[model samples]
Target: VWEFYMPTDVFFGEKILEKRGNIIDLLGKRALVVTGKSSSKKNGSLDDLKKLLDETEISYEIFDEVEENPSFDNVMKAVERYRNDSFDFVVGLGGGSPMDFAKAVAVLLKEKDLSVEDLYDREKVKHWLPVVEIPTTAGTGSEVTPYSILTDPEGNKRGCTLMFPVYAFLDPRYTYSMSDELTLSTGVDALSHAVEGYLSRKSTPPSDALAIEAMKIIHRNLPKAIEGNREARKKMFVASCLAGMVIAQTGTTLAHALGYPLTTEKGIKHGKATGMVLPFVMEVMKEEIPEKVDTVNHIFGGSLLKFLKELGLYEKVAVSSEELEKWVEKGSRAKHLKNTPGTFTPEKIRNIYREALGV
Candidate 1:
């Protein structure tokens, strides 16, 4: 038996943000727009959010400091800013970083005065402020997920659970701002989620269907996206949301667990962080759950590493053997390590890093 809870009402497709503005007031008149420093403004998506919001005279405070791999300090700063301004709700208005911070903002704002440490206390957070999410990237599908990643600065990255968006606005036109490299990176992030969700022990029939559909959609549209097709970008957005919905039920696995440190310490992008290690983790999954791994690869008609290489996502990281050991030791302690279908011994982790680095 499996308990699946995904209840976000999503507004999808081109100009949905504007098309749905009539009902936007239902969320709240006062909104805190949580976003990064520039992408929203540069791509004109900010105007789209502002346009819908301005129509209702629903005022908003823009907290645009949500940087890459959002830090604990970033969240609290926005939390305090929100407290001072006291908006009625939050709008996560960018890629995963801003959207992830917005979820953290919801958790912190709901239980005002909770210590910063409580944010990472897992079960301590149960309630959250309503969040209306508009995603600019076609990956991460953060607009729907109930998790947020925050950097601890203490050489440990923390992920908060039990936070889901109340509303999602997915407009593929917004994703046009991305270049080929980013489009591919974000696209593979969705693929990683689908593959991992399908293989996760918690996966159910419902999640399996969603994951498989996501994989097919990605495999079909990834090349078109890299080739600069708006239709392909739009399709990738749909695939990403499907992957997000799938992972919301099944959660992620060891690849995601190992990826966090890469972004936190090595300055890698979150999508690249998760994606680079995905192929190797899938190989491990094949060893443990052959049928599941085969099912996923069958969709792409190739091996995981080969599929990634075809997508131009695989890379050889440069690190000393000692540093690789440090990475394995640190990645071993990540929570998702336990979610792997197979065991992740330290030796196994080292081998994966070695394989990634071609040592």
Candidate 2:
């Protein structure tokens, strides 16, 4: 038997903020809008959300200090800064980083005694305020996920299923301002989620179906989306939502597991890091899951490696063999590796890195 559950009420469209404006009143009268330093304001989502909240008579505060990948220190700082504010709900109003920080803030604010350790320790999570997610990028699918990935003090990327958003509002207009590189990276991030989900040992039939559909839409529209095609951008947003749903049920596999080091250590963008490792993950999966890999081949019209290179998501980085070994050592312990379909011993992990980076 299989089962699924997603608590978020998702609304997607070009004018979702305007169309579903009335729903904001049900969430709360006061809000803490968590966002990045600039993107929210640049894209106009921040203004639109504020307009909606104002019209609904909801008072709000803005927390815009969230940085890329987010961090334990920053999250704690946000909690410390606003713990006494008594916001009725949290609104995550940018990309993955802000949304993730918002989830942590939502939990820590309510569970005041809990520390970062409690957040990482899933069992210790017992309470959270309602959260509203507004994604300006099509990656991370944080809008519908319980997971929040943040960097810890040890310089490792860690994910915890702290809480899920009560409401997810996706408006394609927000994504229109993304640079071409941002579009490519975030789109590939969505693609990587779908690929990893479909290949994961934990994948269910329903998750696989969603993964394939997401991959199909991404493959057809990503190129167009990068060229400023609004319709294609809209499709990518929907595809990301579907892929997010797939991973919500099945979690991501080796690609994500191995990709973390690249972002944390190499300073690569999240999507570019994950997309670079994805082809290598697929290479390993081909032996264990040849049929599924074959399906992926047809979906992308050829090799994932070639597709990524064409999209400029693949590149050789300056990593020494020693650094590669370290990444392998660290990546081996990654929890998601267990979800990968094929054997991923330390040697296999090392070789994947060796081949991926031409080291």
Candidate 3:
């Protein structure tokens, strides 16, 4: 028998952000809004949200300043702000970093006075406060997931995985403000989520079905979306939400586990980091999880190698094996590594990194 879990309610489509008040009504009265520095405000999305909340007479506090790769300190600060106030629910607005930070903050607040480490300890995260995730980016699928990534000052990345969100508010209009680079990186991230989740050791039949379909949607639409095609952008958001829903059930695998360190230490974006390792990880998993890998490759037009080559993501970045080793060590600390379906050794991970470098 297999089990699948997803967001209780997922409201997606154009102008879905206008439903923020309805979302808050389902969660609680007061909310803590988490976001990155300027995107939400500069684009006027925040103002729109506040206006809606005000009309509903719902109080809120903005915990802005969620950085690209959120840090332990950042999560703690948000938690402190939540504790200092009397918020009943949390709203994660913006990209993966802010949404992830918001999830961590919700977990921390659910267990008052616990540190990031405490929340990350698997034994401790039995439950968390309700979270309403609103994604401004099409990637990361953070809107429907319970995973959070927080970096340490020394550049180690840690994550907390909880149950699925109470609700996910996905407004494709919010993504229209994204620049070309943001759209590309985040779309790639969504692709990675579908690909990696499908190939994960923990994958189930239901999750694989979702991942395969999600990958197909992304593969067909991402390039067009990147080139300013409106229809493609709408398809990409739909695909990304499906990917998030899949990962919420099966979780991600080796690529996600190995990519965090590269992103945290080498300044690579999360999607780029995962994208760099994806083909190699797929190649490696082909031996063990051939059926799943084949499903994904077929979704990308029957050749993973060819698909990546066409996308220009097959070209390797120049990085030393030693540097790769350092990244692997740091990334291995991620909980996802432990959930990899097959055995993973440092040597095997090193080989994957080398392949990422095309060495």
Candidate 4:
């Protein structure tokens, strides 16, 4: 049996917020616009969104304090600051951080009885205010999924479901200002999502189809997009959206599970960390899903390591034996690892980290 469902009404184009700004009226008049410290402002996505809201006479308060790796504490801060306010909806206006923040805040605001710990328990999340996600980056695909991933007080990234956004305004022009490094990181992040979702044990035929197309688009356009090709940038946005759709169905596998420690302990960026370990994760999945792995190999035209080197995303970092043991033990226990097609015992996890990081 197969099941598929996407709740967001997506508007994709050069300046979709301007074109479809009036459609937001249905969500209500009062909104809280959540964003990161600077990217949304620098890219003009914040200003553009505000202009449309003003033109439509939608009242909104801005929360620009979201961190790069958003935490449950950050969500609570927003909830505390705005609990007294009456908001009809929430607008997540930047990349994944702000969008994921919006989703969590929307839930906590309505379900006032729930605590930060309750956010991790999907059953306790009974309601959420409507959310309109305006993505400024091509990565994360937060707009397309029901997931809200946040770092707990313990520094582990945790996610819960049933916080789906009501709308997604995807304007490729917003991503035009991304730095070359940002382009490479986010592009590979999208690639990781497509490949990992395709290999997930729970993957459906429909999700696999989306994964293949998304991977093909990223393989074809990521390089040109990094070189400031306008058409390529647009295609990357579409690819990221499609990749998001894939993960919404299948969830991420071992790549995401293993990438968490690198980000938390070593202060590596999320995308680069995930991308670095992705090829290694695929190496293991290849044993269980050889045909699917070969299809991904063909889509990229060769080894994922070569693709990473070409994109300048390859990195080898050293970790202490102590740290390696902790990461391996922790990652082996992650629910995300269960989605992988093959078993990842503690010994196998250790080897993947050793080989991927050249330890």
lDDT scores of the candidates, listed in order: 0.83, 0.88, 0.78, 0.88
Error of 1 at 250 (Å): 0.9
C-alpha TM-score for every candidate: 0.96, 0.98, 0.92, 0.98
lDDT of 2 by residue, 1-359 (tens): 56677778999987788898578799778999999999899988989988898899999999889999988998988999999888999999999999999999999999999998689887888889989999999877999889899999998898999777988999989999998889998999999989988888888888889999999999999999998999999999999899999889889887887888889988888888888888888888887899999888789988778887887775778898788888988888888877887778889888887777667
Predicted candidate 4 versus true structure: per-residue lDDT over 1-359, tens digit per residue? 77898778989997788898789999898999999998888877998998999999999999999998898788888999998999999999998889989998998888888897897777898888999999988788989999887899899887778567889999999999999888888888889999998989979988999999999899999999998898999999999999999999989988898988898888878888898888888888877898888888888987777888778786668799999999998888898877897777888889989987889
| Lowest-sum lDDT 10-residue window in model 1 | 153-162
lDDT (tens digit, per residue) of candidate 3 on 49-155: 78767866789999888988988888777777678677787888888988888888877777785778876677877767788787888888888887887887677
Candidate 1 structure lDDT: 0.83
Quote the positional error of residue 68 for candidate 2 in Å. Answer: 0.6
- Could you tell me the lDDT of residue 210 within candidate 4? 93
Candidate 4 positional error at 334, Å: 1.0
lDDT of 2: 0.88
Put down candidate 1 lDDT per residue, 101-173, tens digits, no spaces.
8888877887887756788787788777888788988799888898887887585677777568888988888
The residue ranges of model 3 lying beyond 4 angstroms of the native Cα positions read: 19-21, 314-318, 328-345
Query: Of the candidates numbered 1 and 2, which has the greater TM-score value?
Result: 2
Distance from true location, Cα of 176 in model 4, Å: 1.0
